[PDB]
Structure 1
Amino acid sequence: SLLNVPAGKDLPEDIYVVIEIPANADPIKYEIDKESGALFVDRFMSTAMFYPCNYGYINHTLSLDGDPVDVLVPTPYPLQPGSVIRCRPVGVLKMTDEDAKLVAVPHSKLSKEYDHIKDVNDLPELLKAQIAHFFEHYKDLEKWVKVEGWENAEAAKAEIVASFERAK
């Protein structure tokens, strides 16, 4: 089951992200039920918006807000909900609703299209702008958010370590 997926091959550099929401999909917010490991429908988003990246989490992590570390992962093609992808963290969007969303890109073994993206600054400015705007507005018709800013790979990695250790 998805419940048995490890946090990564080598934390915080090499991680696995369990995808819950594909990039560019219908506005259905799914979530893996932590008890069953099954894909539950969390809610039908009320805004006409879509996640600009595949969205999911790192298993075996516990942040402050209670859940696992949530990650956005850009890919050439939308991924299947419930699928697991190997990535390396490169940044973190910090916001207040405080919450942190990491940005991880596919591991070199899955694709070479991202090798050049080592840090938050290497991410296409538009994409960063879209992620922010999305997080800043998807819940408008409901819960609110306030994007504070981006942080580097180090801070993204620190969040992973802290949450994994905190999960233990």
Structure 2
Amino acid sequence: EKLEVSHDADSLCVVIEISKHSNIKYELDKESGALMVDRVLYGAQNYPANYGFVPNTLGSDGDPVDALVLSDVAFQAGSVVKARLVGVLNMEDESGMDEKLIALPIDKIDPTHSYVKDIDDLSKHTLDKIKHFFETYKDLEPNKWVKVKGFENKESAIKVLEKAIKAYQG
């Protein structure tokens, strides 16, 4: 399946593994292309946005860099969406430092938030909800935890992405 990849920070594709408002976390097994049921959120929570990963990249944890795709609608898990970066969320968990790219679907797809140029263009409310979600969505999971540092603009996200792309190429 996965063989297409576009890596432009303003036209990079994200593979949705989790849909917005969903409490079921899926994970794609690149070899089988099979959508795996990784887990069901322990608490009365649900993802604040569409969750996925950028293919052909290597993040800090050995897996392709993760990315959250913000929008009013929830994309189907297993679907792919061309998006653009606007920032990045830095946090720390039991495994180590974790980086999560903040993206929005490209305008030719969905222009509801075309006005969002950088991380600071997203409303305060949304950022707090997302940050609070990650800071607590693993509270009830034994020997698991998260400590959110904060967000960083688009320029910072591009570097995370580019570094993740090179790591996969060598």
Please say whether Structure 1 and Structure 2 have the same fold, judged by a TM-score greater than 0.5.
Answer: yes
Matched residue count: 164
Q: Identify which of 8, 15, 19 aligns with 2:16.
A: 19
Structure 1 match to 2:149: 148
Q: 1:32 to 1:5 in 2, by over 3 A?
A: farther
- % of aligned pairs identical? 46
**Deviation, structure 1 residue 13:** 2.5
Q: Is the 8 A contact 2:60 2:99 kept in 1?
A: no
TM-score by length of 2: 0.93
1-side partners of 2:111 and 2:24: how far apart?
30
Structure 1 match to 2:68: 72
2-side partners of 1:56 and 1:80: how far apart?
11
Structural RMSD (CA): 1.1
**Deviation, structure 1 residue 31:** 0.3
- Which blocks of at least 5 consecutive residues in structure 2 are unaligned? none
Query: What is the SS of the residue equivalent to 1:47?
Result: coil
Range with greater deviation from structure 2 (69-78 or 83-92): 69-78
- Which blocks of at least 5 consecutive residues in structure 1 are unaligned? none
The aligned runs of 1:82-101 (5 Å cut-off) are 82-97=78-93, 98-101=97-100
Query: What is the SS of the residue equivalent to 1:121?
Result: helix
Query: What is the SS of the residue equivalent to 1:155?
Result: helix
**Deviation, structure 1 residue 37:** 1.6
Structure 1 match to 2:58: 62
The letter of the residue matching 1:52 is P
1-side partners of 2:110 and 2:40: how far apart?
32
The letter of the residue matching 2:163 is A
Query: What is the SS of the residue equivalent to 2:43?
Result: coil
Query: What is the SS of the residue equivalent to 1:63?
Result: coil
**Deviation, structure 1 residue 14:** 1.4
2-side partners of 1:154 and 1:65: how far apart?
22
Q: Identify which of 40, 48, 56 aligns with 2:36.
A: 40
**Deviation, structure 1 residue 47:** 1.1
Q: Is the 8 A contact 2:16 2:52 kept in 1?
A: yes
Query: What is the SS of the residue equivalent to 1:146?
Result: strand
2-side partners of 1:29 and 1:5: how far apart?
24
Structure 2 match to 1:119: 118
2-side partners of 1:87 and 1:151: how far apart?
18
